[PDB]
Design a protein around this ligand. Structure first.
Ligand SMILES: [Zn+2]
Ligand SMILES: [Zn+2]
Ligand SMILES: [Zn+2]
Ligand SMILES: [Zn+2]
Ligand SMILES: [Zn+2]
Ligand SMILES: [Zn+2]
Ligand SMILES: [Zn+2]
Ligand SMILES: [Zn+2]
Length: 306
């Protein structure tokens, strides 16, 4: 069996891309991996929202009870300080839901938070982002920043977790981070350097037709152009969705398994994989997905499932 990954993070290095991640927990007081939970997480809310969960710290002389969750890259060994941000939209495609754009079944996939919960693959999410970025069609939000909604155009589907734009790659992501400053230069009646390589945000004298690509702190490529036609400076004068694919690509379209040791059935209590046999004879703790004994690798790879 290949490893079942519930979690995906963006690793700042050495990976510099999206990788499967490991979920971890520590005492919110002492910041040590000694926080014991009465019952494990079952959803993203349990791990993303501060103080949502509780437990008891096994550390000597620590009264902490706050469960603090963080993620790490799974590609390589990592310090417990080397945390990465969780791309909570990215989902394990257990259900084999087709993509909304290429209609291929891939894993993992990004699931928007609209009502229909449309599904899109990471390669097609990249394309959607780069297009919107080039056509300068990101949506401004009220002090939130620039985001995108579901590719279907659904309402209430803006991505709140802006780090999901890291999946564009460092080049495209840098552009996105600079999106606002570009928009604002233009709103101030400024202009961008016509040279595709440069594209500096310039604020030449109002009225001035002759613009030189130069600016604050050494910025500039030295190109000298006309402000009206964007050509080099001249003396004289100028001269998406498929309706069927979108219905197929919906996240919302097995409930009991026999205990592995004793065989009495158990019903799945939430999204948590940690199964505890209530049967006195047995009392096997096991992983709902893998059917094996409960263990750290399971916690890290898929403590809960979505
Ligand atoms: Zn990494
Ligand atoms: Zn503690
Ligand atoms: Zn949608
Ligand atoms: Zn796709
Ligand atoms: Zn320039
Ligand atoms: Zn001109
Ligand atoms: Zn059992
Ligand atoms: Zn497992």
């Amino acid at each position: 069996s290949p490893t079942y990954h519930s979690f995906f993070v963006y690793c700042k290095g050495p990976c510099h891309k999206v990788q499967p991640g490991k979920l971890r927990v520590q005492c919110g007081t002492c910041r040590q991996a000694t926080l014991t939970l009465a019952q494990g997480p079952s959803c993203w809310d349990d791990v993303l929202i501060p103080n949502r969960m509780s437990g008891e710290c096994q550390s000597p002389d620590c009264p902490g009870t706050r469960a603090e969750f963080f993620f790490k890259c799974g590609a390589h060994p990592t310090s417990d300080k080397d945390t990465s941000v969780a791309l909570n939209l990215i989902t394990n495609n257990s259900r084999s839901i087709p993509c909304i754009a290429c209609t291929d079944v891939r894993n993992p996939v990004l699931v928007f938070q609209c009502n229909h919960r449309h599904v899109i693959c990471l390669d097609c999410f990249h394309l959607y982002c780069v297009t919107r970025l080039n056509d300068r069609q990101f949506v401004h939000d009220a002090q939130l920043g620039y985001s995108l909604p579901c590719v279907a155009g659904c309402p209430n589907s803006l991505i709140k977790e802006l780090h999901h734009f890291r999946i564009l790659g460092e080049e495209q992501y840098n552009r996105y981070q600079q999106y606002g400053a570009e928009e604002c230069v233009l709103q101030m009646g400024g202009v961008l350097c016509p040279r595709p390589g440069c594209g500096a945000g310039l604020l030449p004298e109002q009225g001035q037709r002759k613009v030189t690509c130069e600016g604050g702190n050494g910025l500039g490529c030295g190109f000298v152009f006309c402000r009206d036609c964007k050509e080099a400076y001249h003396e004289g004068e100028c001269d998406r969705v498929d309706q069927r694919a979108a219905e197929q690509a919906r996240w919302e379209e097995k409930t009991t398994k026999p205990c592995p040791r004793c065989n009495v059935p158990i019903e799945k209590n939430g999204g948590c994989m940690h199964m505890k046999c209530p049967q006195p004879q047995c009392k096997l703790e096991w992983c709902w997905n893998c059917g094996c004994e409960w263990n750290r690798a399971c916690m890290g790879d898929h403590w809960f499932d979505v």
